[PDB]
Design a protein around this ligand. Structure first.
Ligand SMILES: [Mg+2]
Ligand SMILES: [Mg+2]
Ligand SMILES: [Mg+2]
Ligand SMILES: [Mg+2]
Ligand SMILES: [Mg+2]
Ligand SMILES: [Mg+2]
Ligand SMILES: [Mg+2]
Ligand SMILES: [Mg+2]
Ligand SMILES: [Mg+2]
Ligand SMILES: [Mg+2]
Ligand SMILES: [Mg+2]
Ligand SMILES: [Mg+2]
Ligand SMILES: [Mg+2]
Ligand SMILES: [Mg+2]
Ligand SMILES: [Mg+2]
Ligand SMILES: [Mg+2]
Ligand SMILES: [Mg+2]
Ligand SMILES: [Mg+2]
Ligand SMILES: [Mg+2]
Ligand SMILES: [Mg+2]
Ligand SMILES: [Mg+2]
Ligand SMILES: [Mg+2]
Ligand SMILES: [Mg+2]
Ligand SMILES: [Mg+2]
Ligand SMILES: [Mg+2]
Ligand SMILES: [Mg+2]
Ligand SMILES: [Mg+2]
Ligand SMILES: [Mg+2]
Ligand SMILES: [Mg+2]
Ligand SMILES: [Mg+2]
Ligand SMILES: [Mg+2]
Ligand SMILES: [Mg+2]
Ligand SMILES: [Mg+2]
Ligand SMILES: [Mg+2]
Ligand SMILES: [Mg+2]
Ligand SMILES: [Mg+2]
Ligand SMILES: [Mg+2]
Ligand SMILES: [Mg+2]
Ligand SMILES: [Mg+2]
Ligand SMILES: [Mg+2]
Ligand SMILES: [Mg+2]
Ligand SMILES: [Mg+2]
Ligand SMILES: [Mg+2]
Ligand SMILES: [Mg+2]
Ligand SMILES: [Mg+2]
Ligand SMILES: [Mg+2]
Ligand SMILES: [Mg+2]
Ligand SMILES: [Mg+2]
Ligand SMILES: [Mg+2]
Ligand SMILES: [Mg+2]
Ligand SMILES: [Mg+2]
Ligand SMILES: [Mg+2]
Ligand SMILES: [Mg+2]
Ligand SMILES: [Mg+2]
Ligand SMILES: [Mg+2]
Ligand SMILES: [Mg+2]
Ligand SMILES: [Mg+2]
Ligand SMILES: [Mg+2]
Ligand SMILES: [Mg+2]
Lengths: 134, 263, 158
RNA sequence: CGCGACCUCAGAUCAGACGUGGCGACCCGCUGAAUUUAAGCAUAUUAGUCAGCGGAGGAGAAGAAACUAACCAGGAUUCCCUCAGUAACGGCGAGUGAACAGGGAAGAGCCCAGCGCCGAAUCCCCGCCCCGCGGCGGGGCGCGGGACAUGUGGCGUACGGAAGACCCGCUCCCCGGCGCCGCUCGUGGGGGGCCCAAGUCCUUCUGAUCGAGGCCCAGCCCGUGGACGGUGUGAGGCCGGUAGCGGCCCCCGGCGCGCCGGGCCCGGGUCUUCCCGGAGUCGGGUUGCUUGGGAAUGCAGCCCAAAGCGGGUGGUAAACUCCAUCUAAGGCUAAAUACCGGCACGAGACCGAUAGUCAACAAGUACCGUAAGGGAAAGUUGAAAAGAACUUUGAAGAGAGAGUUCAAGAGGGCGUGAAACCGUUAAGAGGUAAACGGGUGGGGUCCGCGCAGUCCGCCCGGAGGAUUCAACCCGGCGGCGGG
RNA sequence: CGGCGACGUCGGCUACCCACCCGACCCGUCUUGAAACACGGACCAAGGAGUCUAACACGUGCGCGAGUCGGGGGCUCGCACGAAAGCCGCCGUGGCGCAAUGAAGGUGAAGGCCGGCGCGCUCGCCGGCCGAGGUGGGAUCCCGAGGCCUCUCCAGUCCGCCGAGGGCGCACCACCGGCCCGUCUCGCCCGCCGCGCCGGGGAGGUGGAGCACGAGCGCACGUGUUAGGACCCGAAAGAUGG
RNA sequence: CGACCUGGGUAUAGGGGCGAAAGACUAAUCGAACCAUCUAGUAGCUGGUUCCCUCCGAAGUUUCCCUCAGGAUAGCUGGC
RNA sequence: CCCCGCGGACGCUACGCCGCGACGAGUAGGAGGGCCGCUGCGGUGAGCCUUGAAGCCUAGGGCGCGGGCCCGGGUGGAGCCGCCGCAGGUGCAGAUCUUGGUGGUAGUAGCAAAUAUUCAAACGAGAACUUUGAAGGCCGAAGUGGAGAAGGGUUCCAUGU
RNA sequence: CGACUCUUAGCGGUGGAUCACUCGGCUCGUGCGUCGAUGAAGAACGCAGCUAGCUGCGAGAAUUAAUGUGAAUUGCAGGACACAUUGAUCAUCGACACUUCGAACGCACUUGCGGCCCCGGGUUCCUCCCGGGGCUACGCCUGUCUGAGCGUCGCU
């Protein structure tokens, strides 16, 4: 269990930090697991969710095998809007239904220079962990 | 509670000719608070009766001889299968209740080999019972960081920590105790004697020079000797069945004489 | 009001004592803090004795305790004079010195100079510059035999 | 009868600096009550406390004996334990009340004035040159000013010191950098940034699940990680994290060596000759306060007013005498100690929206008072607004349908939704106000699987099945007993 | 032993409404006396009052026991728990207890039986023992004449129970002695590196919270008293600063 | 037509002011304002003082008290 | 020397079980017992729970002398309880108690100081009250008129509801 | 027969108890232990596209730069933003900036009025008007300059 005397286990403090987190660490909080193919291709497990990568919903009413591209990362409400995760409201217009990124799996990553740097940093740390625990 | 609580109001009693109770009332006007009772344990927003204070004497001191006595009693009760079973520790396939393992356990490093050792010692069913007993606490402890509760597993008593602490300590219920620093709060978890204890051989051997024999004092406590019995033979059945007791008795009066209806 | 037999009690609680109450909930923290400071000081004076300078043998004053002997504040100037240690040099090699204590008899004086001589024999003086030893000590014994003594230096026994 | 030097003063928006005000929990200096207790009350107590005023710092103050003791003596200050509710004070009433010794935490010592010697050796400022900047220093030059003999600096301070001799020992100081260690330390010294294990497997429950069952090889996988939080439920393996003498990057700080630039100057022992101290202060009288201090503990006002083998203290006033002990009237000083304010954390057998801070919320807010000041009430839709499109009546509020949702018998002061109180419906009753205790009766609502009323032990008879019943043989396991 | 039993009836004294007979004034409170023409109370919800600290006293439980107690400090990777627990012993300093008494100087708790000596002078030098005296009670324990036994008797084998009497006597109680300190009265001795305005001793009364083969210490709990806001609410007032 | 009425500006502040005087007035407060604090002031006096069953069960009397609406004391009570 | 039968109820949480006898008022007050109740902590129940916790409602079934408790039905939607110990801010009808809410009173008192309104039309869902017109009245220049100071602070002016 | 009244029950109201929840307190502990004339604390007024409060900020005004990060902010709109001839947002915060009162500083304030020195304009150097910038408080130390005295003296 936790032994560091400078990190808290208080429920109120943890909830306060979570709900008043600044957006640059709301980005960390809103991470998603990679698919098994991606987790084999890169030696990484999780990845912060991104505007233009495609995911599958694995829990809830919209779960299924359908790949849907992310269209919005609403960090204020801790949700993401995906392409076909939507419903008709009363007047007939369609509204996106936000779901938590922990309930999706990233199947393809929106790859750029920064994403590649983060992926290789995570893989290198995992590899040094494996060689330390060999 | 705060020493200031309920007493920062400047309220005063209205007197007695105003058809209200003589409790102090908040002064001024223009707010709901004005004219409301204050300072009283019966008043909303007032001071509680006899406010709790930080000098409550939270701590107690127990005689060292008493504490050593309790440790000895807990250790003695941990070697009787009826008492350990009555604490509910699933010692059914345990080969021997004073369960002693070789010293190489002290140098374990991974949790896998600790789990394997418990499985092969047949102490794993107690861990499974702890797993079954993990549930949420009822009440305000959930608000106050005691959210999850579980029962107590076996106590691993060691002599030297060459990694045994880290090998264990991720198994729920397991507490590891140094033989030289035995704790009654861990040996009799709820104040009830009979916790399942697994001894390392080194700890088991040091135990005799730690609390002493009845014919030699403890060599590691400088004044301690084991406490004495006021009853050597506690086998009441054998004592009563003994011929010497039976020779001295009068015959039993086993006939019942009930009320005679006066005709 | 008194009630039957009892003891005439005089509690000293007429003086707003509740504003001046010293709780002791920081006592374990204070013990930890002092222990850590002791460890840090011992690390700081690395081979020098942890407890500090050697204290003299001193007899307790009054008629109740004069059969007992304890450690004093420092060695007297007469003691240092007849032991042959300069009063300004003793404090650098770790001998405490009390300039205001006199010696009224010769037995205490002689006991304390024997104490000083024994300490001076037990001392390992490192050279000021480790490469060049002027008059400190032999490197053969100071390389191995130099360790930090724990507890008081030559503790005073009755 | 002008020009100079000094002294004592003045002015300046002169050149360069410095103080003010805030906070004030802790600390230092003053000032300072009454409620209260004494069963009244005046001394006393409350209390040297509240309020008032001033001054600081990260601590402050104190502090290296004009000490304690009376011993075989101890040895600065501060803090803890104890001494001790004691010695003592007290309408000797109520009440108050230390210290020494002892054991510990910490431990550290010193500097002037004076007396002396040294050609003022001393200091500040302004220029110019070089090395530098990171808080402005070093080195050098000035027939450049000024301070200062009405006393600057070096030696030196009660533990004695100085100077001469004689003897002995050369023994090695502190600063700011160049490169590099041990990488500084309970295994980074500190600050910051980014990362690092393992199920979203099979079958199912659900609105959603983190639920339930399972996962051959001794048991799904990781575990130095089964703290915690989030996520549509209640998660070690979904995510952030957690563990680790784990990883990477950036920045900061004191530690040794060779060298760099400058300072950097003799120490001890013996003998001889010298030199040695703080004054309207001590002390005394008296007055007022204060203290446990009692023929006066401390402080202060006024008056008197010192001495030098003297002076102070030696807890009963005084004289004589011996003794012990210190050396006042100048100064500095870390540590242990304190901390209801501040910055940043961690925790709890605490409270859980009339509680806990007054304040969980646009709270010292709204509002009240001329002002000083007084000062609230007020949390909860849902997983997701999916926050009710559209039709219809009405001028609209408001409705009836329809629709979303697991649920609107969750519809924007919306979780649950008690009681008091009210409306309607149903049943019953009613001229001694209602209500109540005891005893019945009637009616009503429900309950009883109520509605031909229990099971089961043995034996008898009948009608049927089936291994096999006993006894022997083999094997295993127990109980008891054994010189 | 009888009757009755499914869409109509059977049982359910509790529970809902109603009827009748008997009984029935509204609670709280102060009070000799409350239904009172005595006071508070329209109703409902939530809140609301012997608490904590310290100090004593006695009782009870625990540990150790002429001791007991580490509470302050220190040592154990510094720390999930753990601010816990464990340990110290030349850390027991100290506290309380083990000694009292006097204002103080001070002094300070062992006697009994048997012998030879002075004068066994109300007694001094010894010896031998034993080790807190005795009287009356006194739980318990010990001895115990005599009895209780078998199909029977002359004659012993082993112990069980009752038992008049007798004995040792716990604790405790009453009483009598004894000892220690203070203080009176009387009186004769002894001691010496200080011959003294020195020191010690005896007998008989009397004052003491004493002795007379210890019972305390620590912890916990209860009760009672007390100082504190002190079970809760309540003055008229007084003071300081604005 | 007057010791007249009145605006504004000023001065006097709490044991103080001001008063052709009533203890009048001093921000609806005056035989001592208002505000905060000491302060939860003290009360021998009034009011209240929260679950059940079982067992036992009173006193209003003595003595002393600036004692007479209160205490201490003995008695009566309960518990061990 | 039990044996054609190989056999023979229950009990004894010893803090348990059984027997017999007498007794039972109670304020102030004392004591004991409480498998009475509330909240939290240490143990324990391989406890309960989205196949439905707490809470609340109930002409439902019962238990206990009682404090109270258990069970059925409904509503609700996420946590809760038993036992052994521990610890309290632990039990309400009262306090002219505190805060909040709600009754009867009660569709009641009342909407009565300063003479007074009326006709038609317009707008409008709607007119005693608004607007226009007509009439009858009042203030009667020390005004119910026209303008300022102090004070207020946008009330001023249009448009709309 | 109805009304009315009472009791009980179903439903509906009124009300907001209960229960469950908790980004709040309270308590304890630890480590630091830092304000200001280089202008603090406090106050006032301003500042957003739509903005009243709270929060943030200062005429560069819900923020600039720099560094870290690495694609958002979001209630609506708008436009950015090759993420390499550098970048949304957030965090950090060392650069820059920081209105008016306030110890508050030219004098004064329930208002307002000066003086001195530079610069620009109307002037078309001479001093009037306008604007901009810098100064102008009290006390006090060291030094400087200018001084005063029938203070003490020297020389003439
Ligand atoms: Mg409160
Ligand atoms: Mg609950
Ligand atoms: Mg020390
Ligand atoms: Mg100047
Ligand atoms: Mg100041
Ligand atoms: Mg009094
Ligand atoms: Mg009184
Ligand atoms: Mg009085
Ligand atoms: Mg004060
Ligand atoms: Mg200081
Ligand atoms: Mg000082
Ligand atoms: Mg000195
Ligand atoms: Mg004492
Ligand atoms: Mg005093
Ligand atoms: Mg000099
Ligand atoms: Mg992970
Ligand atoms: Mg969860
Ligand atoms: Mg989890
Ligand atoms: Mg980590
Ligand atoms: Mg004397
Ligand atoms: Mg509140
Ligand atoms: Mg509530
Ligand atoms: Mg309306
Ligand atoms: Mg529902
Ligand atoms: Mg609702
Ligand atoms: Mg109804
Ligand atoms: Mg009454
Ligand atoms: Mg009467
Ligand atoms: Mg009555
Ligand atoms: Mg009457
Ligand atoms: Mg009346
Ligand atoms: Mg009355
Ligand atoms: Mg009432
Ligand atoms: Mg009434
Ligand atoms: Mg209540
Ligand atoms: Mg400890
Ligand atoms: Mg001792
Ligand atoms: Mg006797
Ligand atoms: Mg006697
Ligand atoms: Mg008593
Ligand atoms: Mg009170
Ligand atoms: Mg008075
Ligand atoms: Mg009069
Ligand atoms: Mg009061
Ligand atoms: Mg009298
Ligand atoms: Mg009365
Ligand atoms: Mg009877
Ligand atoms: Mg009775
Ligand atoms: Mg209460
Ligand atoms: Mg009530
Ligand atoms: Mg009552
Ligand atoms: Mg009417
Ligand atoms: Mg009318
Ligand atoms: Mg007219
Ligand atoms: Mg007009
Ligand atoms: Mg209802
Ligand atoms: Mg930027
Ligand atoms: Mg003016
Ligand atoms: Mg002159």
């Amino acid at each position: 269990m936790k032994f560091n005397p400078f990190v808290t286990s208080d429920r109120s403090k943890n909830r306060k930090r979570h709900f008043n987190a600044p957006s640059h660490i709301r980005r960390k909080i809103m991470s998603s697991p990679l698919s098994k193919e991606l987790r084999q291709k890169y030696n990484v497990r999780s990845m912060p969710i991104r505007k233009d990568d495609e995911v599958q919903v694995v829990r809830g009413h919209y779960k299924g095998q359908q790949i849907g591209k992310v269209v919005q990362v609403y960090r204020k409400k801790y949700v993401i809007y995906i392409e076909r995760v939507q419903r008709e409201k009363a007047n007939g217009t369609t509204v996106h239904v936000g779901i938590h990124p922990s309930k999706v799996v990233i199947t393809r990553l929106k790859l750029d220079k920064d994403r590649k740097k983060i992926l290789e940093r995570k893989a290198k740390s995992r590899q040094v962990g494996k060689e330390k625990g060999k | 509670v705060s020493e200031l609580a309920g007493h920062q109001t400047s309220a005063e009693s209205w007197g007695t000719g105003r058809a209200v109770a003589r409790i102090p009332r908040v002064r001024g006007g223009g707010t709901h608070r004005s004219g409301q009772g204050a300072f009283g344990n019966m008043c909303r927003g007032g001071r509680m009766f006899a406010p709790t204070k930080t000098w409550r004497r939270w701590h107690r001191r127990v005689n060292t001889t008493q504490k050593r006595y309790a440790i000895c009693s807990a250790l003695a009760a941990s070697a009787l299968p009826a008492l350990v079973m009555s604490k509910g520790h699933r010692i059914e396939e345990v080969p021997e209740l004073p369960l002693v393992v070789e010293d190489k356990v002290e140098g374990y490093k991974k949790t896998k080999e600790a789990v394997l050792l418990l499985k092969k010692l047949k102490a794993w069913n107690d861990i499974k019972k702890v797993y079954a007993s993990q549930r949420m606490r009822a009440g305000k402890g959930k608000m106050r960081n005691r959210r999850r509760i579980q029962r107590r597993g076996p106590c691993i008593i060691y002599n030297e920590d060459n990694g045994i602490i880290k090998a264990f300590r991720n198994i729920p219920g397991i507490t590891l105790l140094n033989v030289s620093k035995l704790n009654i709060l861990k040996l009799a978890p709820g104040g009830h004697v009979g916790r399942f204890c697994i001894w390392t051989e080194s700890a088991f051997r040091k135990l005799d020079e730690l609390y002493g024999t009845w014919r030699k004092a403890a060599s590691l406590k400088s004044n301690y000797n084991l406490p004495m019995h006021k009853m050597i033979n506690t086998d009441l059945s054998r004592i009563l069945k003994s011929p010497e007791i039976q020779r001295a008795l009068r015959a039993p009066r086993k006939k019942i004489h009930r009320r005679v209806l006066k005709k | 009001a008194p009630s039957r037999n009892g003891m005439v009690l005089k509690p000293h609680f007429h003086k707003d004592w509740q504003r001046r109450v010293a709780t002791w909930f920081n006592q374990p923290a204070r013990k930890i803090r002092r222990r850590k400071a002791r460890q840090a000081k011992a690390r700081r004076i690395a081979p020098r004795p942890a407890s500090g300078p050697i204290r003299p043998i001193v007899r307790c004053p009054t008629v109740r305790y004069h059969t007992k002997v304890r450690a004093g504040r420092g060695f007297s100037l007469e003691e240092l004079r007849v032991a042959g240690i300069h009063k300004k040099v003793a404090r650098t090699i770790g001998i405490s010195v009390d300039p205001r204590r006199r010696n009224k008899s010769t037995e205490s004086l002689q006991a304390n100079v024997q104490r000083l001589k024994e300490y001076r024999s037990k001392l390992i003086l490192f050279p000021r510059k480790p490469s060049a030893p002027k008059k400190g000590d032999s490197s053969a014994e100071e390389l191995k035999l130099a360790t930090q003594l724990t507890g008081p230096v030559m503790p005073v026994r009755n």
